[PDB]
């Protein structure tokens, strides 16, 4: 738990949604640290579960949680990623080099490799949820739909089909409500497309049911302009319909590791 007196909140609103709003601030530590504060019974239980997941995670490519504070509203204090979301940054900076995209995409795969090792499912892996510390440093955020996998289960089964980002979801998520690390691999493939399309929305002008109908026909999104063939090959590899033949984050990270080092050297 954190002290409200040490936490200094600013009027500058970073984000806004159904939960409430995300505002910029700075918490007084043992040197002051710039923070992004998520400001809010259903929403309160969600924020507490989101905090418990973030507390269990320790990786340089995962957004770090400072702690929780209860005052004017329930607050989730997390580290500030100055450059903001990946999709919005690329939308405002179309001149970003292809090598720089591979670098940031590989950083997400390293962070996702950790989540696979820690046996955690993200369930909301999109370009909007990838935050930039700098132009060459990316971190994974929004653990609101994230779940800690059971010791005996390799997947998370959801009872109800609530507010879900359909366009980033694997076929087993839509059809059987099953969420594994390989389901996040499919989401990573969509994330890759968004990154190489410079923050463009996937399956534009299409409805959730139309996306499902497209994927059943074996149809996948086209290669973005300027995106290398090897990176688009990995996208389709992530977009394998059957969960069994779809690669894990260890294989996806390695393919990205070897290709990024091939571009630089």
Curated annotation (Swiss-Prot):
Question: How is expression of this protein distributed across tissues?
Answer: Widely expressed in hematopoietic cells (at protein level). Expressed in neutrophils (at protein level). Within the B-cell compartment, expressed from pro- and pre-B cells to plasma cells.
- Impact of altering residue 260 to F? Loss of interaction with BLNK
Residues modified as Phosphoserine are 16, 209
Where is the catalytic site? 124
* Illness association: Immunodeficiency 82 with systemic inflammation: An autosomal dominant immunologic disorder with onset in early childhood. It is characterized by recurrent infections with various organisms, and multi-organ inflammation that manifests as colitis, hepatitis, arthritis and dermatitis. Patients have a propensity for the development of lymphoma, usually in adulthood. Disease severity is variable.
Q: Function of this protein?
A: Non-receptor tyrosine kinase which mediates signal transduction downstream of a variety of transmembrane receptors including classical immunoreceptors like the B-cell receptor (BCR). Regulates several biological processes including innate and adaptive immunity, cell adhesion, osteoclast maturation, platelet activation and vascular development. Assembles into signaling complexes with activated receptors at the plasma membrane via interaction between its SH2 domains and the receptor tyrosine-phosphorylated ITAM domains.
Subunit organization: Interacts with LYN; phosphorylates SYK. Interacts with RHOH (phosphorylated); regulates mast cells activation. Interacts with NFAM1 (phosphorylated); probably involved in BCR signaling. Interacts with VAV1 (via SH2 domain); phosphorylates VAV1 upon BCR activation. Interacts with GAB2 (phosphorylated); probably involved in IgE Fc receptor signaling. Interacts (via its SH2 domains) with CD79A (via its phosphorylated ITAM domain); the interaction stimulates SYK autophosphorylation and activation. Interacts with FCRL3. (Microbial infection) Interacts with Epstein-Barr virus LMP2A.
Q: What is known of its domains?
A: The SH2 domains mediate the interaction of SYK with the phosphorylated ITAM domains of transmembrane proteins. Some proteins like CLEC1B have a partial ITAM domain (also called hemITAM) containing a single YxxL motif. The interaction with SYK requires CLEC1B homodimerization.
Q: Which family does it belong to?
A: Belongs to the protein kinase superfamily. Tyr protein kinase family. SYK/ZAP-70 subfamily.
Which protein, by its recorded name, is this?
Answer: Tyrosine-protein kinase SYK
Upper classification of the organism: Eukaryota, Metazoa, Chordata, Craniata, Vertebrata
Q: Could you say which residues of the full protein are shown?
A: 364 to 635 of 635
